[PDB]
Design a protein around this ligand. Structure first.
Ligand code: 6HE
Length: 153
């Protein structure tokens, strides 16, 4: 479990995301797609995008980044008590979208990448460690739900 102090490090940094969810979302999805291009193929609406410029200009990709970070932010704000939030997310991502845990690791890495990039003076090792622990917990719990749902992930 994360300590309360660890959750406060997580939520202090997420409050930065909350100032500009859309812009953080764009950065995160673009980082994901550039670092792991196979992930882009999972998105039927977005897999035609050829360049970062096209990704930045996509209003629908911007909207999707808001969708993703809105969901993740609610999960983080539960401070581990996220069972209800993970049910629909796990079901769609296991059954419909077919997103392996390794791809959830990739987007976690992108989130951390972007936080470190955007917030160079207020995202140190301890804050990054706490964010990592929160994302690890999310993935652990999603993986358990994937198994319950019948997906190997
Ligand atoms: C590599 C692909 C990938 C990865 C890593 C994710 N997703 Fe997912 N995603 C999320 C939401 C709220 C929705 C719309 C409702 C739904 O269909 O469930 C989608 C839809 C989608 C859709 C339509 C697709 C293809 C999808 N998501 C691929 C996808 C949230 C997330 C979150 C919170 C994460 C991880 C932090 C995430 N996605 C990682």
């Amino acid at each position: 479990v994360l300590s309360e102090g660890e959750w406060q490090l997580v939520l202090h940094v997420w409050a930065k995301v909350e100032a500009d969810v859309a812009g953080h979302g764009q950065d995160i999805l673009i980082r994901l797609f550039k670092s792991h291009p196979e992930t882009l193929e999972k998105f039927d609406r977005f897999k035609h995008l050829k360049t970062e410029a096209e990704m930045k200009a996509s209003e629908d990709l911007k909207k999707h980044g808001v969708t993703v970070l809105t969901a993740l932010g609610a999960i983080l704000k539960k401070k581990g008590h996220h069972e209800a939030e993970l049910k629909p997310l796990a079901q769609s991502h296991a059954t419909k979208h077919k997103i392996p845990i390794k791809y959830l690791e990739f987007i976690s890495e992108a989130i951390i990448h972007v936080l470190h990039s955007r917030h160079p003076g207020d995202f140190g090792a301890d804050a990054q460690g706490a964010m990592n622990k929160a994302l690890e917990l999310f993935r652990k719990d999603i993986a358990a739900k994937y198994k319950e749902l019948g997906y190997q992930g």
